[PDB]
Amino acid sequence: DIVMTQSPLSLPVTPGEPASISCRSSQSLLHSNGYLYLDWYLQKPGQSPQLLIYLGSNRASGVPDRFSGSGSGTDFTLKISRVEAEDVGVYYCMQALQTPGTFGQGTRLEIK
Amino acid sequence: IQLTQSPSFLSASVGDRVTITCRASQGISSDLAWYQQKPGKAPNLLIYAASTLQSGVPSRFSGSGSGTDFTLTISSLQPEDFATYYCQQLNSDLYTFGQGTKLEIK
Amino acid sequence: VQLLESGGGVVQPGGSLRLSCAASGFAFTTYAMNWVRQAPGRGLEWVSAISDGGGSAYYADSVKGRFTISRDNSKNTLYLQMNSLRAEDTAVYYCAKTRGRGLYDYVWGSKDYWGQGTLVTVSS
Amino acid sequence: EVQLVESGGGLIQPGGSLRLSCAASGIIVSSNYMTWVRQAPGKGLEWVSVIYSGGSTFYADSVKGRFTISRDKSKNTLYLQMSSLRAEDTAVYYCARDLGPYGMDVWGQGTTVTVS
Amino acid sequence: VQLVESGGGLVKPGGSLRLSCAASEFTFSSYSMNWVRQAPGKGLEWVSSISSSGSQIYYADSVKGRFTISRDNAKKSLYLQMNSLRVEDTAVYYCATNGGAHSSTWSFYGMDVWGQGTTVTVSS
Amino acid sequence: QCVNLTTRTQLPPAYTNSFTRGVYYPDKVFRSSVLHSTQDLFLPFFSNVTWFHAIRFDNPVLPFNDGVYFASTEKSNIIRGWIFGTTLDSKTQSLLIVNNATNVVIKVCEFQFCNDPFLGVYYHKNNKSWMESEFRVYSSANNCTFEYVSQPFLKNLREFVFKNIDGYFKIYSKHTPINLVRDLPQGFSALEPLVDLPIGINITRFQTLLALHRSYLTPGDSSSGWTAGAAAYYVGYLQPRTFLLKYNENGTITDAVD
Amino acid sequence: YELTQPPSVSVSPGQTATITCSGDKLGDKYACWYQQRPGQSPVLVIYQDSKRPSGIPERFSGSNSGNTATLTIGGTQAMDEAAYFCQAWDSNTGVFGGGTKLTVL
Amino acid sequence: TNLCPFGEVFNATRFASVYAWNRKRISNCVADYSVLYNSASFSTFKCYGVSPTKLNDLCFTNVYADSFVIRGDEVRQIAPGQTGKIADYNYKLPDDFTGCVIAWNSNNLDSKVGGNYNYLYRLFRKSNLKPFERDISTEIYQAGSTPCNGVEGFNCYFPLQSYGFQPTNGVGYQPYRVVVLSFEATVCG
């Protein structure tokens, strides 16, 4: 298994500010073909998970302009450029490289 | 297929919720696309497959409908959002455009 | 794109259930589908994934052997048969379609659209 | 990154000819559904011609037997060979790229063709 | 023939490996091939087998869905694609020739030629 | 597959004498007691017909000039078919006739025939009368059009006449229990038609398909113990001649003169 | 399908060994036998329950009957110390025994 | 002895997609062509070899029965010398075609409330198919200079697109089952 460790587990943010999330992978998630096989999911309270970012930095469809991902090899970062009153909820990183798909524990985002 | 848009001329204030409808003569079932054209500029694709937003278009544009009636909804009007909007029949061989709604910021 | 799931409810430890995901509004013959469960207050864990037309089916090690995944492409229905259910399977189960269809767009990879989840409650 | 640049329009007398260009950077012309779309002054869009990736071409009935669409695979360029231009051909032409179920996503800036 | 395995090396669990078995002569076309592994302190364990034409493939239940055997009689070589590697997959892997052409004949012969195996280590 | 057995055996061919043999019904016309003179392809009387015996069984590709006469002594089912064709390779369709024990399979594919095509034979100890036949005839066989299944064609002498006329592959057969010591008998027998397959291919060469047992196994040879039983098969060649075929009252050809 | 072998057998040099293999109706199938010296590749010594490959001495004699397959090494020599593996097929799936070691004192 | 299987092709509950079109070779039987020409249920019956009423009095070396589903607006392209997405990238009739094509509206079967996404046509290809070429490959189509690396994205498209058949569709966009008999002497009436 590829253990994925997130940080922080809670992230109190005043809306309008920028926010960052991190994911450490025990393997190198690089180049099944040249990409970084890591996805970011947001689960809103009481909703189903929705894809945010795939292959490290590529935004999924319908995802606003502020959700940008980064990082190569083992260190990956989500950056919400400006937090709004609707981004609260848990965020999961995920390795999409090997057939046991491990998520993170889930950075819960809230409002200060 | 004779595509008809309505209304042809429109006016609304900033922040108003605007609904634009393009009517299909027979029924195409998703095969519509929505374009925006500024005065003197090139058309910008907004919504392909009659509901799916093209990448880079703000999430305040929503498309709806299937078959005969389709709708372009701007969930919040903007002062730069004045242009002419066109529907197109996708997956057709005449590439049928509409006449075009000239949306105007009141 | 719609993913409506059937089945789910209350069963007995060691019993067997069947989960059905009904896909509409997209091809589903050219996509790979996932099952991801979430125990109450524990977070997402992957369960199984199947390829475009069956054949390639992958399972999480904690369900390997007990759970079987299958799809009926004429019915556009994704199935998951639960066997010998434990008390550690109490979770809300989501079907999820893979985002891409290329080679190295892995059947277990990015999940574009999820369902609303059906709860499975092993209890007595 | 992805751009279509058009050039070659101008003033031309009725019955005469003119060729339009479409320089594509990023997009392979020889692998795409490349179209030409025109818009008369103060009027709506109107599809003119399309060339498939395989080599098939098609034309609007208002244009058949006059215009000819063609591509140069070496320079990654698209041509629309106009001929016998009537006064109803006074329009601004855009070379688009068509994707079928996906719309015409990329567009050129436009070339304005006058008739007098 | 004389068989020579290659391709076995250290790999982390979940990783992948591809072994190779090149035959000395071209009589390799007349042989069903078998893969056999040997855990470092245990007995021989049959993994998979392919027939002379390649139309008849059977695996062990412990590798079904993960290992994929193949051959190319034009290159007189045998292959094993080894995906979703587990720790219990560490072993010395032998390639052996049956002698029978089809599965209906495998039981009439023994694995008469054995290439010196290749060591596969699967460790975190 | 394709284990090759033709190591070095290069004996010069031997000829027996097909006394009065290979006289088939060259027609579908019933005739009463009448001496009808036919002019078709025939195996001439008292001709030298080449003999193939186990000595084991060089079994080479033979010319299919205008049509062949095939005989076998074969007290055990060891002759198993033939692989008529032009190139006996890919890119050219070839004809394969194989019968197991209760059924005959005919196929016209682009076979990639081995250099020494034959069928392995094994009897499982659980049920001795098994004859588990393994194919070592072709390595690839695909993209084909004709596939016909019927009851099997086959000291129990058997006689065959193959000919390829205007797109048809015509087979005439006659199976006879025989007491004579080694060679073809003397009693006149008239072959009669089995099948007329609309194969429509060009045939210039043919080879017989044998059934070999594995007597022992050296670890790597694949050519170790392929014993070939004990049989003999004769290939004659049909020449265009004029016979005088005496018909019986019932329409059987009791006699002929060259 | 399973095959059962005794972990070890020990015989003095010059004696005769007997390595046995048991399985559910193993006598209705063919049982191969392999000899593996310490740290070497296995060598087939008995196939089809009685037949040896060419080059295998005639003292390697095997038999199969009922649910038991036995291998017999008459005149056991010091060169015979090796593990021995019973082998069979079951619905086109190969099956090896546990592996009987043979210690020639 | 018995008829050639003209009920297996014209009456199957399940046809294929135009990209992966079926083909059945028909040989060594007797064909009752009178079940087709006098059926009164076909929208298209256009023959390019010999006359349809005069069909079961000619013997042929071999017969093929290609069958698939397309829009009604694209039956135009199932003919020799035609062009379009179906003709270029899905099914190409040789311009020396001997045989004929049979199409009949199947909106009652192949259209589903809310779309029927099980039928696919190939939309992206570099070059046109050869006559009677089949193409069932699904590699990502590089519509740009950048290599795709097997990742469907921008300028890298999955080549198959789905007919969204809907019972509300116009008659040109409704599904049409198509059978394309080709002739090339083992079969006749």
Numbering used by the authors:
A (entry chain B): 1 to 112
B (entry chain E): 2 to 107
C (entry chain C), E (entry chain H): 2 to 125
D (entry chain D): 1 to 116
F (entry chain A): 14 to 68, 78 to 176, 187 to 290
G (entry chain L): 2 to 106
H (entry chain R): 333 to 516, 522 to 526
Which sentences from the paper describe this structure?
SARS-CoV-2 variants could induce immune escape by mutations on the receptor-binding domain (RBD) and N-terminal domain (NTD). 501Y.V2 is associated with multiple S mutations, which could be divided into two main subsets, one is clustered in NTD (L18F, D80A, D215G, 242–244Δ, and R246I), and the other is clustered in RBD (K417N, E484K, and N501Y). Combined with the antibodies that we previously identified from convalescents, a total of 831 anti-Spike antibodies were identified from enriched antigen-specific memory B cell clonotypes, and 86 potent SARS-CoV-2 NAbs were selected to test their neutralization ability against circulating mutants, including 501Y.V2. Among 86 potent NAbs identified by high-throughput single-cell VDJ sequencing of peripheral blood mononuclear cells from vaccinees and convalescents, near half anti-RBD NAbs showed major neutralization reductions against the K417N/E484K/N501Y mutation combination, with E484K being the dominant cause.
On the other hand, all 6 anti-NTD NAbs have lost the neutralization ability against 501Y.V2 carrying 242–244Δ, suggesting that the epitopes inducing neutralization on the NTD are much less diverse than those on the RBD, which is consistent with previous observation of NTD supersite. To reveal the molecular mechanism of these NAbs, we characterized their specific interactions with NTD. Importantly, residues 242–244 belong to part of a strand that precedes the N5 loop, and therefore deletion of these residues would drastically alter the conformation of N5. Since N5 is involved in interacting with all the NTD NAbs characterized to date, the 501Y.V2 would inevitably evade most NTD-elicited antibody responses. The NTD-targeting NAbs aim at a common region on NTD and can be easily escaped by the SARS-CoV-2 variants containing the 242–244Δ mutation, such as 501Y.V2, since deletion of these residues would disrupt the structural integrity of this antigenic supersite. In contrast, the 242–244 deletion (242–244Δ) would abolish most neutralization activity of anti-NTD NAbs by interrupting the conformation of NTD antigenic supersite, indicating a much less diversity of anti-NTD NAbs than anti-RBD NAbs.
